[model samples]
Target: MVKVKFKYKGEEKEVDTSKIKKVARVGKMVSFTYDDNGKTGRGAVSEKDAPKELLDMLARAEREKK
Candidate 1:
């Protein structure tokens, strides 16, 4: 399982990636919502703020033939 840690209001917080309920990408925007161990949160990343790895995923998803 993947995990992420961030600072919120000067407090350290961590998320359990395996428990994410929703993940979406609209153009360059990325959003994710999660509920793990009864803790829920929602966050998003703008296109210009997205990491290169994430942008590469967007490219890969776009090139997917369905």
Candidate 2:
């Protein structure tokens, strides 16, 4: 399981890549929501603001292949 942490809107948050339920990338922004151990959370961040860990994990995540 992979976890990524970042601060958004003055709040600190952590997200588990394994627990991610939904993900979308629009333009330069990546957004996702996840549930971990009965707690649910969601956030969005631009590539410029995203941490290295988050960017790496998102890169490894499966993407739509066409």
Candidate 3:
């Protein structure tokens, strides 16, 4: 299992990437929005089962504030 952690609006959370099955299952559209000190983010993987690589990328991006 792989995991990544990051902070959003001063709140930190970790996401697990092991639930994904294959690379093709990764999402195409990932989005993040913030409301003042609150933030919310979601990934739109191409498939319902997102790939770990994609999740890792998202997590890393969040961490880097990319």
Candidate 4:
């Protein structure tokens, strides 16, 4: 699984990219919705903090949304 550094619960941390079930961007924030065990968890990171791969993924999602 891919891993990315993201902000969650007021802290920055590394998270599994494959576990992310949804992604969205609003203003300067890129947000993620991921599966954590049997629960759903959310995370967010700024555009500056997003890695190239994650940024590319977000762009792809946006394209498909239209």
After superposition, which runs of candidate 1 have C-alpha atoms over 4 Å from their true positions?
5-13, 36-40, 46-66
Residue-by-residue lDDT tens digits, candidate 3, 1-66: 433333434565555454322222223444332222233343333322334544554564546453
Global lDDT of each candidate: 0.54, 0.65, 0.39, 0.76
Which candidate number maximizes lDDT? 4
The TM-scores, one per candidate, come to 0.43, 0.53, 0.26, 0.75
Q: What is the C-alpha local distance difference test score of candidate 1?
A: 0.54
Task: Give the better candidate number (2 or 3) by lDDT.
Answer: 2
Best by TM-score: 4
What's model 2's overall lDDT?
Answer: 0.65
- Model 3: lDDT of residue 50: 35
Clashes of 3: 2
* Deviation (Å) of 24 in candidate 4: 1.2
- In order of listing, the candidates' clash counts read 0, 0, 2, 0
Q: Positional deviation of 62 in candidate 3, in angstroms?
A: 0.2
Better of 2 and 3 by TM-score: 2
| Tens digits of lDDT, candidate 1, 1-66 | 223443334565556555656655655556656675556676566656555544444465556631
In the range 3-57, model 2's lDDT, one tens digit per residue, is 4565555687776567767665667777766675556566777767777767775
Q: Ranking by lDDT, best first?
A: 4, 2, 1, 3
Q: What's the distance in Å from true for residue 36, model 1?
A: 4.7
